[PDB]
Design a binder for this molecule. Sequence first.
Ligand SMILES: CCCCCCCCCCCCCCCCC[C@@H](O)O[C@H](CO[C@H](O)CCCCCCCCCCCCCCC)COP(=O)(O)OCC[N+](C)(C)C
Ligand SMILES: CCCCCCCC/C=C\CCCCCCCC(=O)O[C@H](COC(=O)CCCCCCC/C=C/CCCCCCCC)COP(=O)(O)OCCN
Lengths: 83, 70
Amino acid sequence: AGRIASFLKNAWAKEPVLVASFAIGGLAIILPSLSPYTNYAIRINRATPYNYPVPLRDDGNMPDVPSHPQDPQGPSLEWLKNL
Amino acid sequence: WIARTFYDGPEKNYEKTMAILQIEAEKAELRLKELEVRRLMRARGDGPWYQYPTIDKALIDHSPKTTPDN
Ligand SMILES: CCCCCCCCCCCCCCCCC[C@@H](O)O[C@H](CO[C@H](O)CCCCCCCCCCCCCCC)COP(=O)(O)OCC[N+](C)(C)C
Ligand SMILES: CCCCCCCC/C=C\CCCCCCCC(=O)O[C@H](COC(=O)CCCCCCC/C=C/CCCCCCCC)COP(=O)(O)OCCN
């Protein structure tokens, strides 16, 4: 506590560049694990269609699969629009 | 007296030789069979021995590949 405070005050003087660099690197390491928008970034990456969505052959047992894009069933992007 | 206190009868050595010969002959025929079996397995490769690895087919991805023709 006191010794750590003395060390940080002594380093903040005469070595400010190193203190700033270590603080910025530590923040870059720690903060991503706590942000709630990281999962939003993952979902945004998942929603980017690079390939053609290959249709599935209907077999009479696929209720959650849409027959047309306009159909209500299927993934939505309203969370993306509101963002 | 010497025969009684130091030695045994001919039956013991006779039958011990019988057993020893039987064991050794079995070992010889086993060795010959083992050599022949090794030769056959290395030639055909249909046995448990000399099995060389091939590519595991669980690594193949069975999915649409952005192109209908793979
Ligand atoms: C005139 C009468 C005497 C004739 C001369 C006889 C003298 C014999 C001496 C030479 C002996 C030759 C070797 C005989 C023994 C072979 C090894 C073994 O087989 O013998 C064992 C017996 O050996 C004796 O216990 C030990 C013999 C040692 C002799 C040492 C003599 C010299 C010692 C001198 C010491 C002097 C004192 C110290 C002074 C400083 C018993 O054998 P075992 O495995 O059952 O056999 C299986 C078949 N059975 C069951 C039917 C028997
Ligand atoms: C977990 C994050 C890690 C990643 C971030 C770091 C990325 C880049 C930064 C590191 C680069 C390499 C650093 C190498 C360190 C060597 C320093 C050194 O030896 O210099 C000493 C002196 O420097 C020192 O005192 C050593 C380091 C001092 C401490 C610096 C900051 C430590 C951490 C401070 C902040 C920690 C986190 C934030 C706390 C603040 C509140 C938020 C001597 O200087 P000279 O030029 O050779 O001669 C001068 C004398 N004539």
